[PDB]
Write a protein that binds this ligand. Structure first.
Ligand SMILES: CCOc1cc(C(=O)N2CCC(N3CCN(C)CC3)CC2)ccc1Nc1ncc2c(n1)N(C1CCCC1)c1ccccc1C(=O)N2C
Length: 112
């Protein structure tokens, strides 16, 4: 179907919005993969088996790798889920993830 392509172009615009700089203050921890070495996190990969970040999603989107909007949404939500599973809920990163996720969920809910 053609409408799948229209949905994916809406998804690409949503990805560009999540990378926009109105959100920089809370989006920056999600720009790049977690660098466990820079952060001192010897236990991250024990909890998080499938790392995800917006930069990886952008390269996947630039390569036509998402065949429907629902695969894209699953990668974005995976990124958040990794953050929420690894970190305690009172952690700043979780508030920041929720602000970015609110942006995502509001925009994704409009796709037909
Ligand atoms: C892209 C910006 O790099 C970061 C820098 C710093 C920082 O100030 N440094 C560390 C580097 C140190 N120098 C410089 C290099 N040299 C090697 C060593 C010395 C100097 C001091 C902190 C977090 C960063 N980036 C991040 N990326 C995902 C996550 C993430 N931080 N948070 C933090 C986000 C903001 C609050 C906490 C997490 C922290 C622990 C566990 C999980 C997560 C998590 O879930 N995510 C998604």
């Amino acid at each position: 179907t053609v409408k799948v392509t229209e949905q994916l172009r809406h998804c690409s615009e949503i990805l560009k919005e999540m990378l926009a700089k109105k959100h920089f203050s809370y989006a920056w921890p999600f720009y790049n993969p977690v660098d466990v070495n820079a952060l001192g996190l010897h236990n991250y990969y024990d909890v998080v088996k499938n790392p995800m970040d917006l930069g990886t999603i952008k390269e996947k989107m630039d390569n036509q790798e998402y065949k429907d909007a629902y695969k894209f949404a699953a990668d974005v939500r995976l990124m958040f889920m990794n953050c929420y599973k690894y970190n305690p809920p009172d952690h700043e990163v979780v508030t920041m993830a929720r602000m970015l996720q609110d942006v995502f969920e509001t925009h994704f809910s409009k796709i037909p």
